[PDB]
Nucleic acid binder design. Structure first.
Lengths: 97, 105, 94, 91, 520, 95, 106, 81, 96
DNA sequence: ATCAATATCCACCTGCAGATTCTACCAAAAGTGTATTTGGAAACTGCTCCATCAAAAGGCATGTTCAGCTGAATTCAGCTGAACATGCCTTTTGATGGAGCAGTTTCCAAATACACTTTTGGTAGAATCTGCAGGTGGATATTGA
DNA sequence: TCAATATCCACCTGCAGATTCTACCAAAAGTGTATTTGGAAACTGCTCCATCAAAAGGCATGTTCAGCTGAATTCAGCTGAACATGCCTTTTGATGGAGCAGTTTCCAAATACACTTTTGGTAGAATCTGCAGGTGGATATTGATGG
C-alpha cells in the first residue's frame, strides 16, 4: 500500500492553503457561536449576513496571524510541533495577555 | 469653467476631499492648499499600490486585480507592509512562507 | 435616498492611467475605497493635532506635509510630499 | 404556536465544538504549522471565543448606541478598528 | 330570509374577497388536520365563514344581529386562541375592519342606526371591608354572592378582573328592533310612553315630545348666565359655520369648611396663632353644547371661594380644585379658546364680587386617572405638565391684555414678594398639595426653610393670580358634591365619555339625574 | 511677564484629601497624575466624537460619553463610572 | 448665590474647565450641558480609585507620601487598570517584583 | 571624549537594564543587538520629534515634543506633559 | 568566600526591580541623541527635560523588551538570552 | 538507479454573474463673486535656558576560575499524521412573514452668542514644616562550605 | 551550623521639597436675553433578516496503524558569573549668548452666502467579457520496490 511519510502531505496542504483564500471555518457553526455569544451578552439580537461574513474573515485573519506567530515561537524552541506554551508566549508578547 | 482638480492637475476630487475634511470637524479653519495636498498624496499612494497589484496580477497570468493580488502587492513591499502592519486584506490570504526547518532538507 | 459618496471614478481613472488594460473587482474596489478613506482620516487627524500643537487655528499645506513625513514611511513620503508640493505648486500657478 | 413551535429562540449551546478539528487544522496550515498537538484545538477555540466575545461586545454596545436591534457590519468595522484590527472590504 | 340574504351577502362576499386574509377562515378548522389539538378544548362553539354562508343560504337568520354576533364571535375566538404576533391575528383585525366599514351603511339601510357589537370598558369594582380603597383591575380578586368584593390584602371565588359588560338594547313598539340605547339616545324617564324608532316617527309624521330634562331647562344662576353670555358673544364674534350655542349651568353650590391638619393644629391654632377652620363655598359648573340637536357636556370645573367673612390668609380667595373636559366641542379650532373664555369669565365674575387672589394647581393626571368625566377618549392626548403650564399662561396673558387680571406669578415668587416668614401665612385649601405635605414634613425658620425649598422644587406647577355678597342662592346637590360621587355614578351605571355617542348618552343620564335630584 | 498654565492639579489635591486627608503627592508623581487625567480626558472625548460621527449626530451630550465609558473603561470601572455619571447628571439637573 | 456647576453636581473637578477644554478641543461645534458634568465625574472616579490604590501601596510600603513607585505598584497590581494602561509608561515607576519559576534555584 | 558613542553605551548599562528586565544570564552577543534596538528606537523618536520641531519653526527640541513622539509611537510617557 | 553563579544575579534582579533610578548614564545617552539628531538636521539644541524623557522612555521600552526576551528564553527550556530571543520578541511585537 | 501510484500544472472550452457601456435627472456638490474677519507674516526685543569647561566622585574596563548552564548524542512511549468507511449536516435555491430600518414634517427644549458681574485659579515672595535619604549601630536570615 | 555580607529595620537628624497664608487680577464662569436648530414622536414606505422546506455530497467523525518527534537522560566543551584591581568618564556647579516667547502692524488669505453651472450616482436595459468549473493528459514529486 502506498503511504506518504508524515510531513509531505502536511506541506501539501500548507501550500494549498497558502495559495487559496477561501474561508476555512464553516459558516453555519461560526454563526451559531456568534449568536450564542451575542445572546450571552444581550438577548433578542439580529445579525446581518455581511456582519457575520466580516466576523468570519476577521477571525480567520486573527487566527492565521496567531498561528504564524505560534509557528515562529515553536521554531524558536527547536521544535516543529506547536504547543500550548507557544500560543501562550505569542499572546503574552503581543500583549493581550 | 475650470475645476480645482484640473486646475492643479489632480485626478482625485479636490472639492470632495475638502468637503469631507471640513465635514469631519478636524478644525474650524481650512486653507485651500491642504485639500489639494491630501488629494495629491492620495493619487500617489493609490497609483503605487495599483502598480504593485497589477504586477502581482500579471505574475499570476491574470488581467483583473483581485484582493489576493492586493495582499500579495502590499505584503511584498516592506514600506507598504509597515504602512499596513496592523492591517488585514479581506480575501487576500497570506504570502507563501515556509520556515527552513519545516522543509525535509 | 441619501447618496453614499466614494472615490470609484477617480481610482478607476488612476488605474486606467497606470494600467490601461486591467480591471478591478468589486471586493478589491471596496478595499481600495476603505484604504483611501483610512489614509484620508489618519492624515486629517494628524494634521489637525499638529494645528493644535502650535496653537494654529488654520489648516494649510505645511502641517499636511508634516503629517505625510510622520506617517508615510521614509521613501514613500519622499515622493508623496514631493507630489503634493507639485500639485500645490500648480495650484499656485494660475 | 401554530407554525411549529412558539417564539422558538432556540437558546444555543455546544457551538464552540462546531469549530471542528479539521477547521483548526486548516487555520494552522494557513499559518504554516506542520504538526499540531491534540490539546491545541480546544485552546485555539478558547482564544477564538475570547476574541469573538470582545469584538461582539464592542459591536453590540455600538449598536444600542445607534438605537438598533440588528447588528450591522459597519459597527463591527468600528469595533475592530478600535481594537487595533483595521479591516477592509466591509465599509 | 332571502331579502335579508340580499341585504347581508355583499358584506360577507367583500370579506371573502380579502386575500389571503380570509383563507384561514374559509373552511372549518380541524384540530387534528391543522396540528393544534387544543383548539376546540378551549372554545365551546366551532364555526367559520362557511357556517354563516350556509346559515344565510338556508335562511334561518331571524334577525341580522345574530349574523353580526356570529361574525364578531369568530373574531373574538380567533384573537383568543392566537398570539398577537401571528399572521391570522392581523388577518382577523383587517377582516374586522372591513366588516365594520362595509356593514355600517348597509345595516343603516335596513333601519337600525348601527350594526356594531359594542362592549363597555372593564368595570372596576370597589371594596367593602375597608370602605376606602377599590378592587384593582386585571388582578386577583375575591367575590361573594356577586354583591361583595374584596382585594388580595383585605381578607388576609378566585378570579382575575377581565370581564366585559355588553351594551344594553331597547325594543321598538312597532318594530321590536334591538336598537342600541346609547346610539338612539332613548331614556325611560324622558319618554315613559314607549320607545319609537326614527323610521316609525317619519312614517307616521310624528315627532318625539320635547325633552324637559335638557341643560337649558336647568335653573339659571348669575355666574352661569355670565359665563354662557360671554361664550356665546365670543362665538358670535368668531362666526364660524360649525359654531353652536353653549349653555353653562351651575348645578351645585354649598357652603363647607376645611379643617387644619393635626400636625400644624398642635403647632399653631393650639398655641393661638392660626385659625382652627376655614369656611368656603364649593361650586360646580358644567358647559354644554347643542350638537346635532342633542345636548353634550364638554367641560367641568370645581372651585372653592373664601369670601370676606373668612379668617386670613384665606380671605377673599378663589381656588380651582379640579377641571375636566372632553374634546368633542365643535368647531375644534375654537375649543381651546372657548375653554380660556370660561377660565377668564369666572375670574372676571369673582373680580366683580370683590375677590383678590386666584389659585391654580396645574398638574396633569396620572395614567388612567379621570377628574370629572369618566373614560376619556383614547385619542384625547393628555397634556404634559409644561404644555399645561403654557396653556394656563396663554389664558393668563389674554386676561392681562383684557385688564381683567393684573398679573400672575408662581407661589415661590409670590411668597418672596410677600416676605413670608411662617407657614401660617400660606393659604389653606381643601385637597391641596401644601396641607398634606406640611403635615408630612412635620412628621419628618424651623419649618419655613423646608416650605421655601418645596416651592423652589415645584414653583412652575402653582399659579397665583392677582385680580363679598354672592347673588346666587345655595344649590344643594349630593351627586355633584365633589367629583367622587359623579365618578362613582358613571362607573356604576356605565356612563362613559370615550365616544361621541357615549358622551351624549352620559350627558343625558347626568341631566336626568340632576333634574330628578331637585325633587324631594 | 507672567504666563499662566492650566492644570487639574488642585482638584486632584482635593480628591486626595477626600480619599486620604493625611497623605501628600510629590511633584513628579503629581505631574504623572496630571498626564493620566489629561490622557483619560482626551481619549473619552475623542471616542465620544467618534460615536457622534458614526451615528450621524452633530451634538455632544452625556449619552455618547457614557457609551465611550462603556467601550473604553474596564467592566467594573465602566459600570461604576456610569454610576457616578448618572448620579452627577441627575444631581445637576435637579440643582 | 451663583452656585458653581461642580458644586451643583456635587463634584470637585471643574465642570466649567472640562466644558471649555472640550469646546476648544473642536470635537464638535456644539456641546451639551450634561456632558462636562458626566466627563468630570468619570475623571474624578478614575483619579479617586487610583488614589486609594496608590495610598494602599504606600501604606504597605511603610510610607505616608505617595511616590510614582506606589502609582506603578497600584496600577500594575489591578488587572483592570493594568489593561487600562497596558500601553502606557509611567515615569519613575519601575516594574513589579517578579521572579521566573525556571530561573529559581532547585 | 570618544567617538561612536553607540559603543559609548557601556556594557554594564545593558547588564543593569537586563537585570531590571529580570535576566540573570546575558550572552556575549546580547550587548551589540540591544545597542542596535536602542539606537533604532532612537532614530524613530528623534525623527518624529524633530519633525514636530520644524513644524513649530523652532531650533530647539522640547520635552513636550518628546511626549508627542512617544505617544505617537504608542509609548505614551507621563511626567513631562 | 565566593557566591555561586546566580545568587548575586538574583540579588541584582531584586535590587533593580525595587528601584526606579536612572540606569543609563546621562552623558553618553545625551551624546548619542546629539549625533542621531545631527544625522537628520544640523545645529540643534536640546532641553534637559527632553533628554530625560527620551532616556526614561527608552529604558522603559527596553525593560519591557527584556521581560519579553526572558519569557521567550524560558519558552525554549532555557534561562539565558541569545539573539534568537530578541529576534522572536521583536517579531511577535511587530516592529519589523 | 529505476519504477509505479498520485498530486501538480495547465491548456481548452462553455455558461454566466459580474464587469463594463450609453441616456437622462438632478440635488448636492462644485464653482465664481463681494463683504467681512483675523491668523499669522514680519521686525524688535526681553528673558529663558542651552552649550561649554574644570574638579569632585562614583562607579566602569580587564584578567581568573570553575560551577553550572547549554547543547550534542541516544532511546523510546506514544501520539498525532495518513488513509478510509459512513453518513451528516452544512450548502444552495426558493419563497415568505414582518420586525424593524429608514424617509418626511413639526417644532420645542436645548443649544449657541455675547454683555456683564463675580470668584477663582495661577503666580511671586516669606517663612515654618516635614518625609525621607543616607549614615551609624546592631543584627537577623542565609548561603557557601 | 561558625562566619562575611547585603540588606529590614530601630532611630536620627538636615533639607529640598511639600505645605500654609496674604494679595492681585486677568481669565474664566454663571446668569441673563435673544435667536436658532437637532432630533424626538408620529406616520409610513420598504429593504432585508429570520424562518421554513428539500435535496445531496464535501468533508466531519470515527477507528487503525505505525513514523518519528517530543520528552527524558547523560555528559563534555565552555561561556558567562563573581570578584579583585586599576583609573577615568561622569556629574555638578558656574557662565556667556542662540533663540522661545511678548508686543505691534497690517495685508494676503480664509468664511459667509447667494446664485449658477457641472456632474457622480444611478434606475433600467443591452452588450461584452475574465474566469469558475469540468476534461483530459503531460509532468514533477514520493516512496520503497528489484538489486
Amino acid at each position: 500500500p502506498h503511504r506518504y511519510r508524515p510531513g509531505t502531505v502536511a506541506l501539501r496542504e500548507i501550500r494549498r492553503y497558502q495559495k487559496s483564500t477561501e474561508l476555512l471555518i464553516r459558516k453555519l457553526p461560526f454563526q451559531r457561536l456568534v449568536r450564542e455569544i451575542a445572546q450571552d451578552f444581550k438577548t433578542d439580537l439580529r445579525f446581518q449576513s455581511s456582519a457575520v461574513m466580516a466576523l468570519q474573515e476577521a477571525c480567520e485573519a486573527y487566527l492565521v496571524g496567531l498561528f504564524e506567530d505560534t509557528n515562529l515561537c515553536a521554531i524558536h524552541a527547536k521544535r516543529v510541533t506547536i504547543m500550548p506554551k507557544d500560543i501562550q508566549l505569542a499572546r503574552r508578547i503581543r500583549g493581550e495577555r | 469653467a475650470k475645476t480645482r482638480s484640473s486646475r492643479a492637475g489632480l485626478q482625485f476630487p479636490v472639492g470632495r476631499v475638502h468637503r469631507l475634511l471640513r465635514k469631519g470637524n478636524y478644525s474650524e479653519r481650512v486653507g485651500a492648499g491642504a485639500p489639494v495636498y491630501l488629494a495629491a498624496v492620495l493619487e500617489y499612494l493609490t497609483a503605487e499600490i495599483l502598480e504593485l497589484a497589477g504586477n502581482a496580477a500579471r505574475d499570476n497570468k491574470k488581467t483583473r486585480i483581485i484582493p489576493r493580488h492586493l495582499q500579495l502587492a502590499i505584503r511584498n513591499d516592506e514600506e507598504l507592509n509597515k504602512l499596513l502592519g496592523r492591517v488585514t486584506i479581506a480575501q487576500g490570504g497570506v504570502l507563501p512562507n515556509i520556515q527552513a526547518v519545516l522543509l525535509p532538507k | 435616498r441619501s447618496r453614499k459618496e466614494s472615490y470609484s471614478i477617480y481610482v478607476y481613472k488612476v488605474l486606467k492611467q497606470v494600467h490601461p488594460d486591467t480591471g478591478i473587482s468589486s471586493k478589491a474596489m471596496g478595499i481600495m475605497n476603505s484604504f483611501v478613506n483610512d489614509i484620508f482620516e489618519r492624515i486629517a487627524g494628524e494634521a489637525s493635532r499638529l494645528a493644535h500643537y502650535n496653537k494654529r487655528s488654520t489648516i494649510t499645506s505645511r502641517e499636511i506635509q508634516t503629517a505625510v513625513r510622520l506617517l508615510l514611511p521614509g521613501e514613500l513620503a519622499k515622493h508623496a510630499v514631493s507630489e503634493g508640493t507639485k500639485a500645490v505648486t500648480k495650484y499656485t500657478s494660475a | 404556536g401554530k407554525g411549529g413551535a412558539k417564539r422558538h429562540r432556540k437558546v444555543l449551546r455546544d457551538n464552540i465544538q462546531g469549530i471542528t478539528k479539521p477547521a483548526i487544522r486548516r487555520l494552522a496550515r494557513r499559518g504554516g504549522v506542520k504538526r499540531i498537538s491534540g490539546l491545541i484545538y480546544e485552546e485555539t477555540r478558547g482564544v477564538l471565543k475570547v476574541f469573538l466575545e470582545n469584538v461582539i461586545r464592542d459591536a453590540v454596545t455600538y449598536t444600542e448606541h445607534a438605537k438598533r436591534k440588528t447588528v450591522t457590519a459597519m459597527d463591527v468595522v468600528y469595533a475592530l478598528k478600535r481594537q487595533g484590527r483595521t479591516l477592509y472590504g466591509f465599509g | 330570509p332571502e331579502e335579508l340574504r340580499q341585504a347581508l351577502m355583499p358584506t360577507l362576499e367583500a370579506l371573502y374577497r380579502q386575500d389571503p386574509e380570509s383563507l384561514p377562515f374559509r373552511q372549518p378548522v380541524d384540530p387534528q388536520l391543522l396540528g393544534i389539538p387544543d383548539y376546540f378544548d378551549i372554545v365551546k362553539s366551532p364555526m367559520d365563514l362557511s357556517t354563516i354562508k350556509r346559515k344565510l343560504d338556508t335562511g334561518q337568520y331571524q334577525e341580522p344581529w345574530q349574523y353580526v354576533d356570529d361574525i364578531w364571535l369568530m373574531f373574538n375566538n380567533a384573537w383568543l386562541y392566537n398570539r398577537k404576533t401571528s399572521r391570522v391575528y392581523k388577518y382577523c383585525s383587517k377582516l374586522s375592519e372591513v366588516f365594520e366599514q362595509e356593514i355600517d351603511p348597509v345595516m343603516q339601510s335596513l333601519g337600525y342606526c348601527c350594526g356594531r357589537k359594542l362592549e363597555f370598558s372593564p368595570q372596576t369594582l370597589c371594596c367593602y371591608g375597608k370602605q376606602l380603597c377599590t378592587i384593582p383591575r386585571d388582578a386577583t380578586y375575591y367575590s361573594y354572592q356577586n354583591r361583595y368584593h374584596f382585594c388580595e390584602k383585605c381578607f388576609n371565588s378566585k378570579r382575575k378582573n377581565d370581564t366585559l359588560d355588553p351594551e344594553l338594547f331597547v325594543e321598538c313598539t312597532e318594530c321590536g328592533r334591538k336598537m342600541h340605547q346609547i346610539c338612539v339616545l332613548h331614556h325611560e324617564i324622558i319618554w315613559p310612553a314607549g320607545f319609537v324608532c326614527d323610521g316609525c316617527l317619519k312614517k307616521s309624521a310624528r315627532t318625539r315630545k320635547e325633552n324637559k330634562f335638557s341643560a337649558k331647562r336647568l335653573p339659571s344662576t348669575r355666574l352661569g348666565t355670565f359665563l354662557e353670555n360671554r361664550v356665546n358673544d365670543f362665538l358670535r364674534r368668531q362666526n364660524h359655520p360649525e359654531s353652536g350655542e353653549v349653555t353653562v349651568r351651575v348645578v351645585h353650590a354649598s357652603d363647607k369648611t376645611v379643617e387644619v391638619k393635626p400636625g400644624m393644629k398642635a403647632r399653631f391654632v393650639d398655641s393661638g396663632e392660626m385659625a382652627e377652620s376655614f369656611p368656603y363655598r364649593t361650586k360646580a359648573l358644567f358647559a354644554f353644547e347643542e350638537i346635532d340637536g342633542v345636548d353634550l357636556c364638554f367641560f367641568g370645573m370645581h372651585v372653592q371661594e373664601y369670601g370676606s367673612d373668612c379668617p386670613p390668609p384665606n380671605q377673599r380667595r378663589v381656588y380651582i380644585s379640579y377641571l375636566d373636559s372632553v374634546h368633542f366641542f365643535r368647531p375644534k379650532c375654537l375649543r381651546t379658546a372657548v375653554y380660556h373664555e370660561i377660565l377668564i369669565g369666572y375670574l372676571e365674575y369673582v373680580k366683580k364680587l370683590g375677590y383678590t387672589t386666584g389659585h391654580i394647581w396645574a398638574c396633569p393626571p396620572s395614567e388612567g386617572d379621570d377628574y370629572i368625566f369618566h373614560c376619556h377618549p383614547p385619542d384625547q392626548k393628555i397634556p404634559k405638565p409644561k404644555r399645561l403650564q403654557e396653556w394656563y399662561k396663554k389664558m393668563l396673558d389674554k386676561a392681562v391684555s383684557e385688564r381683567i387680571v393684573h398679573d400672575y406669578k408662581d407661589i415661590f415668587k409670590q411668597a418672596t414678594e410677600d416676605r413670608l416668614t411662617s407657614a401660617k401665612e400660606l393659604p389653606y385649601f381643601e385637597g391641596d398639595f401644601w396641607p398634606n405635605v406640611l403635615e408630612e414634613s412635620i412628621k419628618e425658620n424651623d419649618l419655613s426653610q423646608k416650605l421655601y425649598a418645596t416651592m423652589e422644587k415645584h414653583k412652575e406647577v402653582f399659579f397665583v393670580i392677582r385680580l363679598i355678597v354672592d347673588p346666587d342662592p345655595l344649590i344643594p346637590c349630593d351627586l355633584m358634591d365633589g367629583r367622587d360621587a359623579f365618578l362613582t355614578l358613571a362607573r356604576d351605571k356605565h356612563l362613559e365619555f370615550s365616544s361621541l355617542r357615549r358622551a351624549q348618552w352620559s350627558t343625558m343620564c347626568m341631566l336626568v339625574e340632576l333634574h330628578t335630584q331637585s325633587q324631594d
